[PDB]
């Protein structure tokens, strides 16, 4: 009932356009690993794209001007907000269903992350083109927690490896379990093959 989308390898505008439509349909979408979001075009193109965005501020009072968010999660939150009717009541009610996170929170580390193949770099971009990581772009423009998130993301990398290697050994005993017991499960096995489930 809650969409947990992994942001690694996902294009900024293609993911935001699909999330914005799903969020407006009453679906709670949680986007995770926003530092893995990457944008087509060379890195130097996107930097001045964001640096000239920084220059756009209110002259008389910059505190009332555009709030330039530097975190990768809030940058992705900004581009979804521009894809939504946030000036209306239903637009702001939609944005409450969106939840962005840098790295992976402990609420969402022990969960399966969904992947949008339509909003993917490997699908929508030619292999000879250039792309820019949002995580590198954020720290290079004012984000202070890239190395902070990298070590905490490093910490859960072997912690899931322990779970996965235990998971393989857990189902290695499962796959070996049929190997001793075909003589008394063939009654259930063949009817699962006539209907096409193990063939």
């Amino acid at each position: 009932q809650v969409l947990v989308l992994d942001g690694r390898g996902h294009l900024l505008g293609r993911l935001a356009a699909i999330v914005a439509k799903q969020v407006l349909l009453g679906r709670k979408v949680v986007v995770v690993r926003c530092e893995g979001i990457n944008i087509s075009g060379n890195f130097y193109r996107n930097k001045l794209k964001y640096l000239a965005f920084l220059r756009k501020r209110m002259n008389t009072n910059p505190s009332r001007g555009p709030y330039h968010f530097r975190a990768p999660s809030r940058i992705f939150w900004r581009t979804v907000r521009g894809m939504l009717p946030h000036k209306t009541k239903r637009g702001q009610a939609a944005l409450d269903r969106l939840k962005v996170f840098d790295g992976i929170p402990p609420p969402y580390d022990k969960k399966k992350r969904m992947v949008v193949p339509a909003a993917l770099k490997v699908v929508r971009l030619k292999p000879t083109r250039k792309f820019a990581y949002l995580g590198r772009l954020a720290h290079e423009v004012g984000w202070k927690y890239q190395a902070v998130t990298a070590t905490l993301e490093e910490k859960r990398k072997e912690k899931a490896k322990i779970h996965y290697r235990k998971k393989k050994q857990l189902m290695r005993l499962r796959k070996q379990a049929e190997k001793n017991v075909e003589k008394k499960i063939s009654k259930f096995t063949d009817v699962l093959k006539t209907h096409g489930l193990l063939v």
Binding site: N59, T60, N61, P62, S63, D102, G103, Y145, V148, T149, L152
Partner: protein, 394 residues
């Protein structure tokens, strides 16, 4: 059109929010970073401004016109009684910033520190930490305290210490001590935690933290000056005498299509009581407080290698509007922020000090202890007695 003759703007915009400080005690916004090679030590201390006086010293800077000459320097007197460590705090480090992990206090807390946890000490029953101090005489409590300490061994990255000043030794009217987190910089987390556990309920003198001829940073609140105009706060040009609506103002504020008045224009408002951070202050001398041995006390705080006089740094009649300095003190070159009796934050430098100025040792020759309550002309009381002689009242 354009401005006829160019001139730099009045006032820096880095100190733009010239409001009254939300805090009264100076705050360390950025503690010095730590490396595991150094031993564990304190990085900040909290003192109180007493007064200022002269100094005489030899200059040993090569290549100057003033080399090997006697000079006078304005020096601040900051009375710095030792602290009492009452607790420690651990900090886990998050992608959203720095977050406190767990705060562990002492078993019994002195009533000077208990003043801070109350807005009204007279009406209160002084019931703070009464059930928390019951955790130290039950066997489940000690195991929980060790479990809390063992939890900070694993997860905490930055460890600070909670220490408070001692109002009993100071001559100030107030008795409410100021709590302060001081970051402990040194080795790894484990020995850092064990060192602060030992230092609980212990006296921390100034000499552990700072040393002589060392760059430090002074953090404090500006002297209050109340509501002020643009001429006093921003130092703008006074308008000529022929102005009708006044002359201590700003004449042209803004342009037309800039339909809002800008944030960069000098306007009247609160002047003073601003939080400030002054860097590169030189410690000429870390003094010693009054102490009694063999019956009589020792007060030769103003004694140097050449003066050898048993006078103290307290001038004739005491420091103006402060009192008498009886505890140990630090002597900082140049004026510091804040008025008399103002709480001052002392902090180690955030920059690597390798200069001719910052590595020059100081040898004091004469400390001026004359009366600052007017044009004083005598160092000690008995020197004036030898000059005046007998009086009518004798």
């Amino acid at each position: 059109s354009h401005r006829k003759f160019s001139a730099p703007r009045h006032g820096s915009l880095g100190f733009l929010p010239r409001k009254r400080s939300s805090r009264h005690r100076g705050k360390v916004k950025s503690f010095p970073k730590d490396d595991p090679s150094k031993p564990v030590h304190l990085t900040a201390f909290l003192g109180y401004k007493a007064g200022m006086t002269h100094i005489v010293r030899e200059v040993d800077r090569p290549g100057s016109k003033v080399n090997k000459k006697e000079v006078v320097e304005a020096v601040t007197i900051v009375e710095t009684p030792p602290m009492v460590v009452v607790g420690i705090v651990g900090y886990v480090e998050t992608p959203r910033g720095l977050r406190t992990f767990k705060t562990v206090f002492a078993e019994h807390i002195s009533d000077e520190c208990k003043r801070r946890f109350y807005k009204n000490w007279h009406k209160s029953k002084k019931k703070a930490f009464t059930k928390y101090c019951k955790k130290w005489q039950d066997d489940a409590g000690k195991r929980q305290l060790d479990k809390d300490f063992s939890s900070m061994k694993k997860y905490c990255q930055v460890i600070r210490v909670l220490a408070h000043t001692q109002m009993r030794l100071l001559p100030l009217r107030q008795k409410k001590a100021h709590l302060m987190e001081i970051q402990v910089n040194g080795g790894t987390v484990a020995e850092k935690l064990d060192w602060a556990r030992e230092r609980l309920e212990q006296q921390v003198p100034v000499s552990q933290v700072f040393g002589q001829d060392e760059m430090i940073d002074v953090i404090g609140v500006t002297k209050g000056k109340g509501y002020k105009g643009v001429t006093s706060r921003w130092h703008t040009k006074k308008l000529p005498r022929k102005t009708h609506r006044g002359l201590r103002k700003v004449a042209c504020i803004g342009a037309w299509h800039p339909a809002r008045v800008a944030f960069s224009v000098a306007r009247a408002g609160q002047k003073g009581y601003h939080h400030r951070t002054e860097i590169n202050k030189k410690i000429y001398k870390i003094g010693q407080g009054y102490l009694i041995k063999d019956g009589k006390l020792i007060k030769n705080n103003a004694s140097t290698d050449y003066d050898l006089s048993d006078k103290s740094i307290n001038p004739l009649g005491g420091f103006v509007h402060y009192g008498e300095v009886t505890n140990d003190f630090v002597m900082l070159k140049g004026c510091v922020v804040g008025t008399k009796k103002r709480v001052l934050t002392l902090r180690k430098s955030l920059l690597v000090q390798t200069k001719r100025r910052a590595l020059e040792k100081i040898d004091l020759k004469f400390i001026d202890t004359t009366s600052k309550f007017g044009h004083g002309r005598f160092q000690t009381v008995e020197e004036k007695k030898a000059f005046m002689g007998p009086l009518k009242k004798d």
